[model samples]
Target: EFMKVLVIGNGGREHALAWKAAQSPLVETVFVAPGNAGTALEPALQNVAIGVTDIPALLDFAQNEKIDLTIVGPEAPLVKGVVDTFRAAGLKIFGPTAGAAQLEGSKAFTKDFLARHKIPTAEYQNFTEVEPALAYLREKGAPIVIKAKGVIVAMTLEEAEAAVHDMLAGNAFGDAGHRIVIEEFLDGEEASFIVMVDGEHVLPMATSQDHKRVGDKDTGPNTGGMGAYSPAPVVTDDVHQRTMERIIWPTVKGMAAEGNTYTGFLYAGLMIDKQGNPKVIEFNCRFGDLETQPIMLRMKSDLVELCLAACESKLDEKTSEWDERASLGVVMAAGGYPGDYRTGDVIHGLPLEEVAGGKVFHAGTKLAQVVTNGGRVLCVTALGHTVAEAQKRAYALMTDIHWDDCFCRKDIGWRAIER
Candidate 1:
């Protein structure tokens, strides 16, 4: 039953989806809209030029191409209701509704939803304006609440106070941050739990952890994610079961009860305490970018089947198989990333792939013989019997590739290695 699949996005997440979908025996051709150079390298993968948020064009492309299944890779389109649009037009697509997508689109909405469902999440307070937020900040004091999440760990009272003013007053995070969500600082080992959902059903994926700080040793400013390793030691077998019972189940069932059932890949960013207690850090409507690379390296199931099952409401009949080996991904970003830096420096050592069963997924690169072109340029992903070995092998491949103004954190799987 060969099928045509379309993946929407331009990052490594889209590339990985296109790559994986191409591997399925049930798939004939895989197309990626606004795909990157790396995606272009695969013969089975065709690159399309429609932008992610260009909902109408994407729909038209899918319709014209006779696409059998479409997978969305970014939150923007999902939050904009591409799933609703495509479904109404009689197309098979995988993603949550616009209302269901608020789990990732808005911090305040997610926090409120978590609260309403009694999901295990950090204590929080939401504010719509500045002065009241400032007053609350004054009363709560520093080392008390975080503007969103993550460290850069812990902000001083002054930094916290300034952050509130910046967001509520100055549009630091745009309309997205118009309402500030200040929550208690959550401390624990952060693990990413991915699951394929078909409305009310859930199928958990491998547990991975990502490095969010720009520099190594977990220091520096927050980033979209610099590196990630799968089978995080922190999310033990017991922890995984507990997470399903405590966090994932409640959120999924709660969303259904709220009349917006989630129906796609759901990523729950969790902080697991020393007691194996897991708390929700965040929820993403789709697979995470940096995390997807390494997870794809380890996933053994047909991604096309998983996605199709989600769309067809047949997740209850499917199960995902994963490689037992640990997989790690190191992000090689353009020199001034996490702020503003370099691109178009061009890339050398183009084919340094699968150096002993590893792969490179491109994030921001242009053709003209493969050149670095975005904040996060490429990710070196590898698999090993252990995370340290995966990390070592992945970094070793980096030496074979060269580019101007290219950099990556040196210690990616340090936390897992320590454990």
Candidate 2:
């Protein structure tokens, strides 16, 4: 049995991890190096007062406290090689090293990875300058997807065009934008396929769909994610087997060929064409944000056991299982999210007491006064026996909660549910 655990992220994902870890009988205490408002009330959890990016401080704290295990939840730290540093000190960490995080850190690398592995994806062209990229976009037409290369924000066509123009005028995405890829955006329902990878071992879990836009009816700018729902209706058993064989299997196989020996949670953003063939869109080295919230709700296995297995490279040996039911998550963001936004808005409905098992993953907030940190705020997730039930519970929770400066998309998972 594990003695104690430490989580290294500060958003809703961290809160969700701490919430689940607190329930494990084997876990004596769940510690968050840098906790948020959502975790402030957790009696079983303690906030360590260290920022997630402060590696040396975190390492020292882990050493002093004798933390048995640590989990990483943010991309910046992962991309900066925090896992490698922690492991170098003989500390067991759950996350990909910087070398492996390139899957999300670099888009050009992913495009090449898809091609080398023969993994089906959108047709793309990469450019080092804006002129050629604009020329390509002009030739490709409006329906295509234009990325700001290393830009973290996922933008639609119009948004991408404007962002690209600004980035071209001034260096944006830093060096990441110097090399941008413009691709033909495929038309279909987008879903997240997250798998836990332990070395060459890959275990595929349930599927989820995220609403990227800020407004209902899928209109408006794309934010981190307005909401999410798991076990997407489009991913049937037949689709599951085919996607695993055609898209996912080849990816793991290819990474093995390259000697990466992939470890930690692997997220595959997929766009299934009208023909029902799933293709890779993007990859996240860790579990997705709001998407993971819903998936976490349906998880039936012991999280401590799973974390121990993952840390010790024995995940394949553990029976890490999830419920057959469906789940949904809705995100609340500040008044002017995805651009400039306000903080310290004092969020409401942050569960003073646990009800059986319900959760609101805190993305960006403060505990002292409940101020906003980033564009997205809390992610409310619920689990039920059916998709409809899950949706009903999730929406009800969204309405019950109130914050005058916050707004969220009302129609999440409409593509699958309305269809």
Candidate 3:
């Protein structure tokens, strides 16, 4: 028997999901909706031309293709209620409902939820206008955090004021900028903690962390991501247990109590102190980008089965496995990324299947044309017995690729290596 699976999204994360799902012997075909250049080059994976937010079109495709299982890779569709549409039409899809997806949709909403549940998070307040927000800024001063259509960390008054003008008046993020959440900044090591949920059951996956800033030492403005590694040493076992009891449990139960049964993957971006105490930074409704690249490389479980169980509300009956070895992924981006960037540059590396333990997952390239098409281009991932070894393998593969406008961070897993 063979199953046809559908993965929605066109980023590096989606490529990894599509690739891993295709590895299942039970899955004959893995169709990625509007997939990327990487999925196009891989066997058993096909890219559908449909856009991720076009729910009706996607539902129609799933129906016509007889897709056995569908896994959503990005949060926009989930926040738009794609899963609800599929479920209403009697199709199996893995993702949280629109209500549950609000965790990622609105920073103010999430902060309130965390405060209500007594979940550890930075102290925060919501603002709806520039004058009042500016007044608060003056009252609190610099070093505070502001999250909305965008996020700014350290802020000189002028820089903070400019950011506010960019978001609220300049229409930087559309209506998402209408409201902003400002919080006290907290310092610690950040980690991505992801778990699979089926309304009640929670299956926590191995930990990973991503470098969000564009620079080497997290100095520049945050880009989508630069690199990531799995089995984050920062998330010690003690912290994981506390996170389960303090964050995951409260989150799942809290959402349910609010009449929104949380289903699908719950990714908590946590900040942990030297004492291993963790606090919420943000929450994502789907798997992380570069983090997924490495995590998928180390995953030994059948992603297809795990996705199916989530769709059927049977995650409590399913199990997952991963390679004990650490996996690291480094992003190769076009010049001027996280900003205005040019595209259509010809990428020099292809069919990089020969790299001993490395896998190249594409995001921005076109299959046969092999030209850059998106902001973040490709992720180079490798597995090794140690984080340092994995970092070395990933970096070695990075040198093998070339593009006129491509660049990547020299030190990807520096945190782990330093630790």
User: Which candidate has the highest TM-score of all?
Assistant: 1
Where does model 1 exceed 4 Å of error? 126-143, 146-181, 352-356
- Per-residue CA lDDT of model 3 for 170-232, tens digit only, reads 553556537777787777888999999999899988799888888887777788889899998
lDDT of candidates 1 onward, in order: 0.85, 0.78, 0.86
TM-score of each: 0.90, 0.87, 0.89
Clashing pairs in 2: 12-362, 12-363, 344-371, 344-372
Question: lDDT by residue for model 2 over 214-272, one digit each (tens)?
Answer: 88898767778888888877777777787889887787777777876677888888888
Tens digits of lDDT, candidate 1, 87-125: 999999988889899999987788678878788887767
Highest lDDT: give the candidate number.
3
- Rank order (by lDDT, best first): 3, 1, 2
TM-score leaderboard ranking: 1, 3, 2
User: Which residue pairs does candidate 3 place in steric collision?
Assistant: none
In model 1, the clashing pairs are none
Question: What is candidate 3's CA lDDT for residue 365?
Answer: 80
Clashes of each: 0, 4, 0
